[PDB]
Amino acid sequence: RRAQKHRLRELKIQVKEFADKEEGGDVKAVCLTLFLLALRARNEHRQADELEAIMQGRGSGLQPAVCLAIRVNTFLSCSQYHKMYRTVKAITGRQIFQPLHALRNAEKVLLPGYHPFEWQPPLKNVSSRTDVGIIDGLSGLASSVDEYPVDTIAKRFRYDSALVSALMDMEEDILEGMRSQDLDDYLNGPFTVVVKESCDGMGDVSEKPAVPEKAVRFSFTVMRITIEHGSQNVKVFEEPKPNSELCCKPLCLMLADESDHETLTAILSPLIAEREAMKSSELTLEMGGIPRTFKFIFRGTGYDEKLVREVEGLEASGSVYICTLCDTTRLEASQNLVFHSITRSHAENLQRYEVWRSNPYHESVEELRDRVKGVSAKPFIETVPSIDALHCDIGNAAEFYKIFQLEIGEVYKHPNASKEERKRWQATLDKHLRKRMNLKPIMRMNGNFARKLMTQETVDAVCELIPSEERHEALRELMDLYLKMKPVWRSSCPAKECPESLCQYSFNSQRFAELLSTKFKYRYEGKITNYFHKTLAHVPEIIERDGSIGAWASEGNQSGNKLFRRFRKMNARQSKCYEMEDVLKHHWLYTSKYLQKFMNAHNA
């Protein structure tokens, strides 16, 4: 101590006077900087980084929101976190992870049912309380033996108290958006939220077999928050990647089929009641001090073709009537390929069901169905007509994979070989393509199978299998017209990212239509599949209507399905009446934005 100072005291007084004579007498700063530069020089920056942290005076422990970010974004249990916490605290003495109770006390801020809020005018048929979280999803549907039997389980939040917490976990993101867009921070204009709604059945959830059980989630997302300052509208907040895995928030879930129509209406009726309530109101709610006012715009878009065909009240997908957007039969599509419009709203379908029920013109079913254009049920969900982006691409992939298997067998020379040539054609196709591209033969086509197979190189491989020569022209021209056509709907913002193909798309599409109708009319002379109608005829109207096609798709809901199985398999109380509380709660906590701001700390 004193003696070891006395060993090197000559340097001590030397460096001391050196620090007084030039650096003034700030001995501590120049000596610590000397130790930093002398310890970094031997490449041991770990000690220097922690020593800079201990001189800066930063705490060793963690805030409970960081601990909750760790416990949710890593899928630990609530019993293994206790293991990690107790032995970290025991080994390094000072605690770094918080205990479980201060974690759950910091959980209740981020769920629905914590904040005060009020509507103006108050909502009809909706309760006025502010502090309800997870309710039973059956909505008091009575289960006595005298009535209709039910056995499903469902949980949900309210709709308004979900939107309140979903707005106040992104308070920082709209405040920084107002700062970066040259607006005054103390503003309380009528903000408009744009909410994209999505619902998709995700069956085969069960774990054991011979009894498959299914499930249905109903979810939403925020997509654009916009204030009207002065005389213009500005995008205060915009979504980075809309159809992402972790930016759609769960709102209701149930264990039922997508086709059990009575149960599905019994659960999704109160949510549509609340949604139709909050379309003529203003939510006043504090956003950093002063209260602000929100007004919502709902677009229900993230439905696949079967769900959008069922709840909007149409005939099923194998109909004579194909388009959910227009009213033309499939025998009318193959003649006029691209000149259609969009004329299937929701209220039009509701009055057409009223026409079907009343039968006011006194005519039989064969012309009444033609008069109402195949509407034969009461539609009960307000949805906008659109096309998807995922299932469209997978459908086009399987369709010209089938045309590859057709063109191997040379049907243009002689038709109608029986169903024994075709299995050989399939075998030679996937054997050849596995030989060249190493693509394993898969029954259920995915999107990655599309991303590999939709390639000019594989076209050249099947060209090396198909005998003739002009078929290479009639196949390669088709494939590069399709590859030119794809990124106008695959893109998330094709108004600015690919504004070349988007302007050349009409010419590029009608040329494709002509090449399908001339050199391929041995398949498309009568029938045509649904997705070649949507991709060809409508998308230069959906672009000018909305913008993207890829942003308004169910890829988030389709990507979230593993989180159901994982959360249920590792984090649940195993009682089937609490078991859907916990899956919903964890899937709420996962896709918060206040927690993903911590797991991107290293990016900052």
Q: Which helix (H) or strand (E) holds 274?
A: helix 261-277
Taking residues 151 to 170 in sequence order and writing x for each that binds a copy of itself by CB under 8 A, - otherwise, the string is: --------------------
323 interacts with Zn ion by CB under 5 A:
yes
Using a 10 angstrom Cβ sphere, with 0-12 exposed, 13-18 middle and 19 or more buried, the burial of residue 314 is buried
Taking residue 438's Cβ as centre, other Cβ atoms within 10 Å add up to 8
d(Cα 142, Cα 150) in Å, to the nearest integer? 9
Of the residues 20, 25, 86, 297, which one makes contact with a copy of itself according to CB under 8 A: 86
326 interacts with Zn ion by CB under 5 A:
yes
Taking residue 225's Cβ as centre, other Cβ atoms within 10 Å add up to 22
Q: Select from 117, 355, 171, 157 the least CA-distant residue to 275.
A: 157
Name the binder of 200 from Zn ion, Ca ion, a copy of itself, none, CB < 5-8 A by kind.
Answer: Ca ion
Residues 116-155 that bind Zn ion (CB under 5 A): none
Mode of pairing for the β-strands spanning 190-201 and 291-302: parallel
Least distance between a copy of itself and beta carbon 555 (Å): 22
Least distance between a copy of itself and beta carbon 255 (Å): 15
b/e per residue 76-90 (b: at least 16 CB within 10 A): beeeebeeebeeeee
d(Cα 482, Cα 225) in Å, to the nearest integer? 35
Measured in whole angstroms, the distance separating CA 298 from the mean position of its chain's CA atoms is: 16
**Nearer to a copy of itself among residue 84 and residue 350 (C-beta):** 84
**Nearer to a copy of itself among residue 208 and residue 414 (C-beta):** 208
Q: Which helix (H) or strand (E) holds 49?
A: helix 45-56
b/e per residue 584-601 (b: at least 16 CB within 10 A): bbbbbbbbbbbbebbeee
Residues 8-67 that bind a copy of itself (CB under 8 A): 8, 11-12, 14-15, 18-19, 22-23, 26-40, 42, 46-47, 49-51, 53-55, 58-62, 66
Name the binder of 323 from Ca ion, Zn ion, a copy of itself, none, CB < 5-8 A by kind.
Answer: Zn ion
**Nearer to Zn ion among residue 533 and residue 568 (C-beta):** 533
599 interacts with a copy of itself by CB under 8 A:
yes
The footprint of Ca ion (CB under 5 A) covers 200-201, 304, 558
Taking residues 169 to 208 in sequence order and writing x for each that binds a copy of itself by CB under 8 A, - otherwise, the string is: -----------------------------------x-xxx
Name the binder of 558 from Zn ion, Ca ion, a copy of itself, none, CB < 5-8 A by kind.
Answer: Ca ion
Helix intervals (H) in 77-230: 80-92, 100-104, 160-167, 171-180
**Nearer to Ca ion among residue 306 and residue 369 (C-beta):** 306
Of the residues 20, 25, 80, 127, which one makes contact with a copy of itself according to CB under 8 A: 80
Residue whose pair of structure tokens reads 């693509």 in the numeric block: 439
Least distance between a copy of itself and beta carbon 305 (Å): 26
Is the bond leading into 494 cis (omega within 30 degrees of zero)? no
**Nearer to a copy of itself among residue 61 and residue 291 (C-beta):** 61
d(Cα 190, Cα 90) in Å, to the nearest integer? 53
Using a 10 angstrom Cβ sphere, with 0-12 exposed, 13-18 middle and 19 or more buried, the burial of residue 260 is middle
Residues 521-540 that bind a copy of itself (CB under 8 A): none
Name the binder of 395 from Zn ion, Ca ion, a copy of itself, none, CB < 5-8 A by kind.
Answer: none
Pick the stretch among 11-19, 76-84, 374-382, 527-535 that binds Zn ion (CB under 5 A): 527-535
**Nearer to Ca ion among residue 263 and residue 558 (C-beta):** 558
Least distance between Zn ion and beta carbon 326 (Å): 3
Of the residues 20, 83, 241, 359, which one makes contact with a copy of itself according to CB under 8 A: 83
291 interacts with a copy of itself by CB under 8 A:
no
Name the binder of 69 from Ca ion, Zn ion, a copy of itself, none, CB < 5-8 A by kind.
Answer: a copy of itself
Helix intervals (H) in 114-231: 160-167, 171-180
b/e per residue 376-410 (b: at least 16 CB within 10 A): ebebbbbbbbbbbbbbbbbbbbbebbeebbbbbbe
Q: Are 178 and 238 in contact (CB under 8 A)?
A: no
Q: Which residues bind Zn ion (CB under 5 A)?
A: 323, 325-326, 340, 533, 538
